[PDB]
Design a protein around this ligand. Structure first.
Ligand code: FMN
Ligand code: SF4
Ligand code: SF4
Ligand code: SF4
Ligand code: SF4
Ligand code: SF4
Ligand code: FES
Ligand code: FES
Ligand code: ZN
Lengths: 73, 111, 192, 105, 95, 244, 79, 434
């Protein structure tokens, strides 16, 4: 739907990767920091990324787009 | 084939390592920041007629985004159809994901 | 939940006016007189300490901007000071600020036995002011050798800058710390 | 014949601005000013019809200005030499960060 | 017949004007000759009893555009009799 | 020996020159030059992160440590004034091991995002890790993480990569003439920022992209568009004004 | 010799006539000797690493590149 | 005497009000001998005050133990236009130390007189006293004494009638341990963050406001007038050679009676612990380790504590230091591994963050020490922990980076089998349970 996706995606039957990643709700974390590997098996994921959750907005993993939020505060 | 995460997000982050290492210069990439801030490609092309099927791109990729799949039966009647674009490669990954993931699990103990 | 950046809030935003009160400009002048007139930045710590006393024990961003104007520096230089030193509170605290949970020299003598009792009585968690805005609990700056640990610190901002005190109380037990908070509520200064 | 009369520039590439290391300077290259490229109208790939599109940066290098100049005139290329800019090493002191402002004026 | 013997023996027995440079290294013994002596030096190496350099492995050029004699012609040679290899090089220009 | 980068040295008077030894070799430098500058004159490239020739000396990254004769400790060459008779060693086991240790500390909390970092391929940290501290990584604990800050439409921020070199802070106060960037906090949790929300309004603000040695401060409109190795460099001049 | 050839047994067949028929027989015998070497290599095959461990030209394992900063930098440079 | 040291008698104590049983203010101070013939001392000149300081062998009381007389002589002899400043370090945030607080609590005029005496000996025009921000009562106590001195003509223009103009100003911090460092103190006094400077320049050449400056401890300053009145030879009579004078000690921890006391230099540690503090709790037999002075020196095991003397030189010879002479005593019941991991948190928390090895190394040492507390580590990780301390030591801007590595190095040097036992036990439990 966006201009970035329209450059390569000429098929409107399915949802774009941008919309698909926006649909998965943020993952709630007990703590201010979370490590994302992108896979249950770290060797099959992306390089480990440590994400700070100090902001109120959901924090995005810069590799896979998963979002994390603080569970309590 | 280009792969995705189980959420549907593309694995490729436009690092251009595969493009730099490709001995045949068969890969052409363009990229920019997506509307949500993500680092993603807007163009990913592989000239299947320049490619030498070496697997160097698969070795260079840090997120297991580009892979050489098990398919070998894709002869075409035109030169044009062998100029693979991003959408075609992502289609290949969708079609062959279950076999690719199985091979990656088996081969993970060696690389 | 101390953070090294500022998020705007109705009671904490630059547009809120903040000056030093007229009774406090006399104290400001003598502070500035201790240093050469072209080295006024030297007074940032006593002026921030004075500003925090006047504002009831905490430093809103408008207060840091006011101190920056007094010494004629960019406010980022004042922000650097306020975030570097642990005696400056950048979030609201109660009229009486209680400091518990000491460091290495005291916990050998069982310091971590007073904190849980204090939150239990106040019915709050750490860092949060009570509903009447009287009491808040924060981390304690530790001094001495803690021969008489457990120990707590009480900072009194109930009466602006002319009634400010910063005292250490020895032999504090789960039953003495309750007595301390009661006289603080009643207005009687607890002994030390 | 036709490619021997093109104008070139003999120059020493300067240090990049994104890195503080100096381990690429001292090199001398012949710029062929190959600036005729376009887009292929099937994929948009960068097309070019100039044989000297990339040889000046990939393979042709010279360790000195004189070596670069002699090769160009033997081949018949009309060249212009651009001298490289060099930094001036100036006296710096860590003590200057604490200089006394002087008597209050 | 190691690379030490060939280096030392060649210095004693070869005509002095034939060789300009001699390098002994694990990357290969290497004689740099002048263009007018290349033929005679190779004939000496082939026919002499203590060298017997009978096999010419290959001849290759190298381009050095920064040099007044840009081309370097490298002769790789083998002695099956003594199980040793020798490199002889010379420089040349476009004319 | 040729000075590093062909750097020119100007002498006010030949009498105002001192003699120093860099790895044995003898060099003549003006009085007031630092040990690092004497190394540059002697054609020796000393790794550095916090030092910039156009900014005040900071001496905080500790990557420029060299061995000086009769000195009990490794010396920060960027800050120490060179002296007559000084014997400077830059490749002895003390200097090499000091660089290895500092590099290990620098990469301790650095994020693993070279593939998504625009500095990749033109990164001082990558190169000096390749060259000086070629030490396999042994840090297995949890890295620290930092939230990103909004500095306007020109400077993109990823502060996990920041190595606290304070080059940007010093540029803002000494070159840009606008004091908006500072270093907030204390310890390993210190953060470069403006504290209050505000954008970099100086007309020279884009230069913090060049001086930041890591991908912490990058060009927002250029973000992810290309890698440095695929770019052709043309040396020209600007026509936006009459400065050239 | 190179690699482990000096620790292996094999014979070197040579001709006596220098004709096409000799070279045919030599290639047959070389195939027999090649079989001999393979059998010895199979039985003498030791365990251990199959890449050199100097982290200058050897790619790191996929697991370390995704876990260690130094390995990711090395992987970036090598490719 | 020359053979044994200790038992400092009551007529040889410089701080006669250490226990605070008498009035600390001006009237009580002159009765005790303060502000006595101060005009005569100033009229002797700077070269005599410096010379008598050198003969007294007074050493730096802030921890480094530098000869105070030589340090004062570093100051310029002729003013080049810039004024000279004396800065008094009352910023004692070191754990387990309160000697400077007691001096300001009960003997503020000794400090004030020392400021005037030290100022003359450095040709200084103004003194700044930097007090720890948490000493709010102590600061107000010194301020009351400072008004008493100004009102009586002892300070300010024409101090004590001597013709010497000297200003005394009081400044305070805001809760940072690093501000005790001399250059970090100067940065804080200028209104900046408490980040230590590199050396050179040295403060004697470019210190506060870039002017010649001497940063000295409260104890060093407060003893200078008494050294002048009673003479240096009396001062150097106490203690061994090169370790002369008296010292304020404060013993804490697992002793029968913790106390702060003034004793001779070079007094044996054991004698100080048993004779002054009633001995180690549970007998000298129950002793795991002693930290001699403050948390910035490595601990020493029970065998070393048997014969070591409390001076700068003796404690250096056993890979320790006198520091602030704050004695922390640990008996056999203490978890020494937990004790060191606690100190590692203190140094990680107190790092100013300026330089790379301290900013990142201190937190790495703390994380490892937290893992070694419960044995969640490998045996080989003890060697790595030693190597991490060596990467921090000697590569930092200031000495906090060194002070962070020393307690970890001492733990490995003296208690490695205790570490290994925890790791083996943890792996032993891991095998059986799962
Ligand atoms: C981290 C650190 C903290 C220090 N704290 C103090 C202190 O609280 N009081 C003090 O007198 N010296 C302290 N010092 C030592 C000072 O840097 C300096 O040596 C001292 O003020 C000089 O005083 P002196 O010569 O009288 O001993 C500290 C040093 C460091 C590295
Ligand atoms: S297999 Fe990959 S790396 Fe090899 S030529 Fe084809 S596209 Fe390039
Ligand atoms: S396919 Fe892999 S290597 Fe190629 S650009 Fe995408 S992430 Fe990088
Ligand atoms: S700054 Fe970027 S390219 Fe350099 S090491 Fe860090 S992540 Fe990699
Ligand atoms: S953002 Fe870049 S320039 Fe600024 S302190 Fe961090 S690493 Fe240095
Ligand atoms: S050693 Fe620690 S306290 Fe000292 S300057 Fe460096 S980071 Fe700051
Ligand atoms: S509990 Fe001991 S200093 Fe706070
Ligand atoms: S370059 Fe010298 S310490 Fe950073
Ligand atoms: Zn992820």
């Amino acid at each position: 739907v966006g201009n970035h996706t329209a450059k390569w995606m000429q098929d409107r039957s399915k949802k774009s990767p941008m919309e698909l990643i926006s649909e998965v709700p943020p993952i709630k974390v007990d703590g201010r920091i979370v490590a994302c590997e992108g896979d249950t098996n770290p060797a099959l994921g992306h390089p480990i990324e440590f994400i700070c959750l100090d902001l109120n907005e959901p924090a995005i993993c810069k590799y896979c787009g998963l979002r994390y939020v603080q569970d309590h505060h | 084939a280009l792969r995705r995460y189980p959420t549907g997000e593309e694995r490729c982050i436009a690092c251009k390592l595969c493009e730099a290492v490709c001995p045949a210069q068969a890969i052409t990439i363009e990229a920019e920041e997506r509307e949500d801030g993500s680092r993603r490609t807007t163009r990913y092309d592989i000239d299947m007629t320049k490619c030498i099927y070496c697997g160097f791109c698969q070795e260079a990729c840090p997120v297991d985004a580009i892979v050489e799949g098990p398919n070998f039966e894709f002869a075409t009647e035109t030169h044009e159809e062998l100029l693979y674009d991003k959408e075609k490669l992502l289609e290949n990954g969708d079609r062959w994901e279950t076999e690719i993931a199985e091979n990656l699990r088996s081969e993970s103990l060696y690389r | 939940t101390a953070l090294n950046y500022h998020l705007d809030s109705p009671d904490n935003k630059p547009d809120l006016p903040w000056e030093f009160s007229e009774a406090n400009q006399s104290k400001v002048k003598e502070i500035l007189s201790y240093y050469p007139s072209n080295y006024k930045q030297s007074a940032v710590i006593p002026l921030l300490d004075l500003a925090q006393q006047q504002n009831g024990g905490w430093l809103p961003v408008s207060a840091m901007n006011a101190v920056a104007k007094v010494i004629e520096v960019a406010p980022i230089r004042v922000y650097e000071v306020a975030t570097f030193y642990s005696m400056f509170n950048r979030a609201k605290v109660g009229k009486y600020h209680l400091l518990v949970c000491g460091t290495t020299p005291c916990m050998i003598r069982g310091s971590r036995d007073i904190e849980s009792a204090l939150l239990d009585h106040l019915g709050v968690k750490r860092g949060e002011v009570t509903k009447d805005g009287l009491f808040s609990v924060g981390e304690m700056e530790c001094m001495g050798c803690c021969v008489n640990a457990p120990m707590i610190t009480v900072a009194d901002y109930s009466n602006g800058s002319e009634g400010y005190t910063y005292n250490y109380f020895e032999d504090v037990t789960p039953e003495k710390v309750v007595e301390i908070v009661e006289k603080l509520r009643k207005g009687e200064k607890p002994p030390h | 014949e036709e490619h021997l009369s093109r104008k070139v520039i003999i120059y020493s590439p300067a240090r990049t601005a994104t890195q503080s290391g100096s381990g690429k300077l001292g090199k001398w290259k012949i710029n062929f000013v190959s600036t005729l490229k376009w887009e292929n109208p099937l994929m948009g790939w960068t097309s070019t019809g100039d044989p000297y599109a990339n040889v000046g940066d990939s393979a042709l290098a010279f360790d000195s200005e004189e070596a670069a100049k002699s090769f160009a005139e033997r081949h018949g290329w009309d060249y212009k030499v651009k001298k490289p800019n060099t930094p001036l090493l100036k006296v710096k002191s860590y003590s200057d960060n604490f200089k006394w402002k002087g008597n209050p004026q | 017949m190691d690379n030490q013997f060939i280096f030392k023996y060649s210095w004693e027995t070869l005509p002095k004007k034939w060789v300009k440079k001699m390098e002994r290294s694990e990357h290969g013994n290497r004689f740099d000759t002048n263009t007018d002596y290349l033929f005679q030096l190779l004939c000496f190496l082939k026919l002499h009893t203590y060298t017997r350099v009978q096999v010419l492995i290959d001849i290759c050029g190298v381009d050095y555009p920064s040099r007044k004699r840009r081309f370097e012609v490298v002769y790789n040679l083998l002695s099956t009799r003594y199980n040793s290899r020798i490199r002889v090089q010379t420089s040349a220009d476009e004319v | 020996r040729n000075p590093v980068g062909g750097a020119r040295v100007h002498f006010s008077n030949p009498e105002d020159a001192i003699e120093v030894f860099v790895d044995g070799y003898a060099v003549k430098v003006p009085k007031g030059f630092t040990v690092l500058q004497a190394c540059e004159v002697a054609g020796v490239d000393i790794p550095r992160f916090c030092y910039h020739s156009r900014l005040s000396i900071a001496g905080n990254c500790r990557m420029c440590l060299v061995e000086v004769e009769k000195s009990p400790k490794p010396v920060a060459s960027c800050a120490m004034p060179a002296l007559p008779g000084m014997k400077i060693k830059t490749d002895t086991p003390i200097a090499k091991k000091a660089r290895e240790g500092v590099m290990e500390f620098l990469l301790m909390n650095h994020p693993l995002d070279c593939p998504i970092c625009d500095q990749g391929g033109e990164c001082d940290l990558q190169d000096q890790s390749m060259a000086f501290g070629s030490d396999r990584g042994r840090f297995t604990e949890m890295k620290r993480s930092v939230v990103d800050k909004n500095l306007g439409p020109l400077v993109k921020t990823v502060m996990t990569r920041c190595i606290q070199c304070t080059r940007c802070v010093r540029f803002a106060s000494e070159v840009a003439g606008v004091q908006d960037l500072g270093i907030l906090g204390r310890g390993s949790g210190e953060e470069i920022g403006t504290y209050v929300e505000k954008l970099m309004t100086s007309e020279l603000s884009g230069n913090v992209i060049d001086i930041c040695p890591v991908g912490a401060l990058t060009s927002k409109p250029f973000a992810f568009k290309a890698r440095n190795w695929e770019l052709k460099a043309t040396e020209t001049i600007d026509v936006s004004d009459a400065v050239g | 010799p190179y690699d482990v050839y000096d620790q292996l047994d094999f014979d070197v067949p040579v001709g006596t006539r220098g004709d096409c028929y000799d070279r045919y027989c030599i290639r047959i015998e070389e195939m027999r000797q090649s079989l001999r070497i393979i059998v010895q290599c199979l039985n003498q095959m030791p365990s251990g690493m199959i890449k050199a461990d100097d982290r200058k030209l050897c790619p790191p394992s996929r697991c370390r590149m995704k876990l260690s900063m130094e390995s990711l930098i090395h992987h970036f440079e090598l490719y | 005497e020359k053979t044994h040291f200790g038992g400092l008698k009551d007529e040889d104590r410089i701080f006669t009000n250490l226990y605070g049983l008498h009035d600390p203010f001006l009237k009580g101070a002159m009765k005790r001998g303060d502000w006595h013939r101060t005009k005569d001392l100033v009229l002797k000149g700077t070269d005599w005050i410096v010379n008598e300081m050198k003969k007294s062998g007074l050493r730096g009381r802030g921890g480094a133990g530098f000869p105070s007389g030589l340090k004062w002589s570093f100051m310029p002899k002729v003013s080049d236009g810039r004024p000279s400043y004396l800065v008094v370090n009352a910023d004692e945030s070191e754990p387990g130390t309160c000697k400077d607080r007691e001096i300001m609590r009960h003997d503020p005029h000794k400090l004030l007189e020392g400021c005037l005496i030290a100022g003359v000996g450095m040709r200084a025009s103004a003194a700044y006293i930097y007090i720890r921000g948490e000493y709010v009562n102590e600061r107000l106590n010194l301020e009351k004494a400072r008004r008493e001195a100004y009102a009586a003509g002892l300070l300010g223009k024409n101090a004590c009638g001597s013709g010497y103009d000297f200003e005394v100003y009081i400044h305070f911090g805001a809760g940072a341990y690093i501000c005790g460092e001399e250059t970090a103190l100067l940065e804080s006094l200028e209104g900046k963050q408490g980040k230590p400077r590199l050396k050179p320049p040295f403060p004697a050449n470019a210190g506060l406001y870039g002017c010649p400056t001497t940063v000295t401890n409260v104890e060093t300053v407060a003893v200078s007038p008494t050294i002048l009145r009673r003479g240096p030879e009396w001062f150097s009579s106490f203690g061994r050679k090169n370790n002369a004078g008296t010292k304020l000690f404060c013993i804490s921890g697992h002793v029968n009676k913790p106390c702060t006391v003034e004793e001779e230099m070079s007094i044996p540690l054991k004698e100080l612990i048993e004779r002054h503090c009633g001995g180690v709790r549970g007998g000298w037999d129950n002793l795991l380790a002693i930290i001699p002075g403050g948390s910035s020196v490595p601990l020493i095991p029970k065998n070393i504590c048997e014969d070591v003397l409390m001076d700068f030189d003796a404690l250096k010879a056993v890979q320790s230091g006198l520091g602030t002479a704050a004695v922390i005593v640990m008996d056999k019941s203490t978890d020494v591994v937990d004790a060191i991991a606690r100190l590692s948190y203190f140094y990680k928390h107190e790092s100013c963050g300026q330089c790379t090895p301290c900013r990142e190394g201190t937190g790495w040492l703390w994380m490892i020490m937290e893992r070694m507390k419960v044995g969640n580590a490998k045996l080989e990780e003890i060697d790595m922990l030693q190597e991490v301390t060596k990467q921090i030591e000697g590569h930092t801007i200031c000495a906090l980076g060194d002070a962070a590595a020393w307690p970890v190095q001492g733990l490995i040097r003296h208690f490695r089998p205790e570490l290994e036992r925890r790791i083996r036990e943890r792996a032993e439990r891991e095998l059986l349970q799962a």
